[PDB]
Design a protein around this ligand. Structure first.
Ligand SMILES: Nc1ncnc2c1ncn2[C@@H]1O[C@H](COP(=O)(O)O)[C@@H](O)[C@H]1O
Length: 554
């Protein structure tokens, strides 16, 4: 009742909700130093549109730095900045810091409740069970202001919005809160699975924010099931888990020896093939809740294999700037997933990214079917007309609310997990290898790359065509791998050296003429610059036939 109406109101009243939101945002902010600069002295949409510049992160980083260093929030926001969000996006190798306050949590939990309703409208059999949700709290990074920088969901978990969350199936997990709150994710992932297994009959949903993490959970399961079952059998958690909260809370889940349940799970895990393993271990699971769009699409085949084509439900599109909105057709196929922006989240504008829309910038209500755009965000934390760097495509309309397929993050050439390595990053990394090559009597002719997920964990593959005896200097080429990795950003390093979600960077040295042949291949397809990443399977086949040596970082 209330919900059908709530969604009707949100999606029919788009222009006026957006315009009221803008006014709500701008009015108290006229006296901030940032807006004073552009003479926004009263609210007026036309003046905001004429005088407030559309900016990139780098344009306004100087203002952000000052707040990070302890200066008054009102440099940019009359609503007090009480923390920051650590973006997966980076600047000079360091994670971007976006301003944050409780409004972010009000939006987030609003979105959680809305999508909960969307899911329950379309999926039956969930209200009595729990979810085995692979949820992780990360470590924060203190800023000189005394305000912490956290990743988005951690800013939620480390708050009473989470601790005092609603008491219903959607917020009920097989893992104790202590597990979710444990900053050691090697330990918390292990515990997630153990708790999941002990309470396997109650599991009606499983998932994680992103598909990569769901895949890693299953792979870790495949690598740990013997140990997990030993804990279940004895009723004791392995000694190696150090986190006191995990020890205490998981001890209670376990309760005592469960040899019989251990036998049951071992029998399942001992089968010939891991196919359908998630459904076999968790037979009451109704769906998998995880983002399968953007670069996460690469994990869809693996997920279907492990999950016996249980529905993959991809609910939410969001960022460090703002949550955007949700998938109002949760049971659609991963390739047809679009996200309906919610007009109460932030004020949204769009920069056309093809010829289909000749305007310079357009409101949410005005985006055209079939056109791509870059979202531009004005939020409740001191970001005004901020370009987001994602490309989206309008695929439809729910009432008056446009629905958007996520196309890509612009410039990104390599992404396995949370890492997002852009073309510039790659060029820098390759540049370091070049120095190594020069220092060993070689030079680099050309290069390209590829995100390999054919094995776990996934890793970056870089093809190098070198030029000047019986053998390649393996020490030098190994060193090339190392310097490339070392030039990458903190997010890659965390995944690689702490999460183990990314494996050693691999260099594949290719034969003389490889990249000339590559060029021949592409122009035979119709076509020039060597692409900096390859996503065509045929081109990839061409490269592979050219490989003469393989090296790995470490
Ligand atoms: N549902 C989704 N589908 C595809 N890409 C997403 C989704 N949610 C987030 N992303 C990507 O992750 C970025 C957010 O990074 P962050 O600043 O770390 O929160 C977005 O701008 C997108 O590039």
């Amino acid at each position: 009742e209330t919900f059908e109406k709530q969604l009707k109101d949100l999606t029919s009243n788009v222009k006026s909700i957006q315009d009221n939101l803008l006014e709500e945002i701008i009015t108290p902010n006229t006296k901030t130093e940032y807006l004073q600069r552009f003479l926004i002295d009263r609210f007026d949409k036309e003046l905001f549109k004429k005088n407030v510049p559309i900016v990139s992160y780098e344009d306004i980083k100087p203002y952000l730095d000052r707040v990070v260093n302890g200066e008054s929030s009102d440099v940019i926001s009359a609503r007090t900045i009480t923390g920051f969000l650590l973006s997966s996006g980076t600047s000079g190798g360091a994670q971007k810091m976006m301003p944050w306050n409780n409004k972010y949590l009000d939006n987030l939990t609003f979105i959680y409740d809305l999508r909960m309703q969307v899911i329950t409208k379309h999926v039956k059999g969930v209200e009595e069970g729990k979810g085995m949700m692979f949820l992780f709290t990360k470590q924060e990074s203190m800023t000189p202001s005394g305000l912490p920088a956290r990743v988005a969901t951690s800013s939620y978990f480390k708050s009473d919005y989470f601790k005092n969350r609603p008491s219903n199936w959607y917020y009920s997990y097989t893992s104790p809160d202590e597990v979710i709150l444990c900053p050691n994710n090697t330990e918390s992932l292990y515990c997630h699975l153990l708790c999941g297994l002990v309470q396997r009959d109650e599991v009606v949903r499983t998932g994680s924010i992103f598909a990569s993490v769901m895949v890693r959970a299953i792979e870790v399961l495949k690598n740990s099931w013997e140990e997990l079952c030993s804990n279940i059998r004895s009723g004791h958690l392995s000694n190696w888990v150090t986190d006191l909260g995990c020890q205490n809370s998981v001890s209670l889940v376990l309760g005592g020896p469960r040899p019989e349940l251990a036998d049951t799970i071992e029998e399942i895990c001992n089968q010939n093939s891991w196919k359908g393993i998630v459904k076999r271990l968790w037979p009451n699971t109704k769906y998998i809740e995880t983002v399968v769009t953007g670069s996460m699409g690469q994990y869809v085949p693996m997920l279907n294999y492990y999950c016996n084509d249980l529905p993959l439900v991809s609910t939410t599109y969001g960022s460090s700037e703002t949550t955007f909105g949700i998938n109002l057709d949760p049971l659609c196929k991963p390739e047809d997933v679009s996200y309906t922006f919610m007009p109460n989240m932030s004020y949204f504008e769009f920069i056309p990214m093809d010829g289909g829309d000749k305007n310079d910038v357009v409101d949410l209500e005005d985006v055209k079917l079939g056109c791509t755009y870059e979202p531009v965000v004005t939020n409740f934390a001191g970001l005004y007309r901020m370009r987001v760097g994602d490309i989206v495509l309008v695929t439809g309309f729910y009432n008056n609310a446009p629905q958007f397929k996520f196309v890509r993050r612009e410039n990104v050439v390599l992404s396995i997990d949370s890492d997002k390595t852009n073309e510039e990053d790659l060029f820098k990394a390759v540049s370091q290898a070049k120095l190594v090559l020069e220092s060993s009597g070689l030079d680099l002719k050309d290069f390209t790359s590829y995100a390999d997920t054919s094995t776990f964990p996934g890793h970056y593959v870089v093809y190098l065509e070198v030029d000047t005896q019986f053998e390649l200097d393996e020490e030098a080429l190994s060193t090339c791998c190392l310097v490339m990795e070392e030039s990458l950003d903190n997010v890659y390093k965390r995944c690689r050296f702490k999460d183990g979600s990314i494996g050693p960077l691999e260099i594949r040295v290719v034969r003389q003429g490889t990249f000339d042949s590559l060029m021949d291949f592409f122009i035979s397809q119709g076509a020039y610059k060597t692409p900096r990443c390859i996503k065509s399977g045929k081109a990839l086949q061409v490269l592979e036939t050219c490989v003469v040596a393989k090296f790995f970082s470490i």
